[PDB]
Amino acid sequence: GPMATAVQNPLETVVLQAWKDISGADDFTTTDSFLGHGGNSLHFVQLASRLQKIFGVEVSTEDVFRHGTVEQLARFVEQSRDTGRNPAAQTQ
Fold first, then answer.
1. What are phi and psi of 31, to 5 degrees?
2. How far is the first Cα of the chain from the last one, in angstroms, to the nearest whole number?
3. Torsion of CA 21, 23, 25, 31, to 10 degrees
4. Which of these, 62, 66, 57, 60, lies nearest to 85 by C-alpha position?
5. What is the distance between the alpha carbons of residues 75 and 80, in angstroms, rounded to a whole number?
6. What gap in Å lies between CA 70 and CA 19, rounded to an integer?
7. Please, what are the domains in the chain?
8. Cα–Cα distance list, 29 to 17, 20, 34, 90 (Å)
9. Whole-angstrom Cα distance, residue 28 to residue 16?
10. Could you give the angle at the alpha carbon of 20 between the alpha carbons of 18 and 26, nearest 5°?
């Protein structure tokens, strides 16, 4: 293949563990479609609200659907969660 992780952020890993905990699908990668291994119902509602409270982002159910992949999902959060970047030091 091209690379191993290539450009994989640990944030993407959170998106995957979110999906794994909800759907049970483990053999998903960051470039694969988390868009419903089987049940594509409320399962996305749970993970969107999950990332929301984890990184301090505002991810909606349909926002999940607009990204398509966990990587591109994480990209939304990546940029948005930077607003609270380094919250312990408070960027002082």
1. -100, 5
2. 42
3. -90
4. 57
5. 8
6. 9
7. 10-81 (1.10.1200.10)
8. 11, 11, 9, 33
9. 7
10. 140
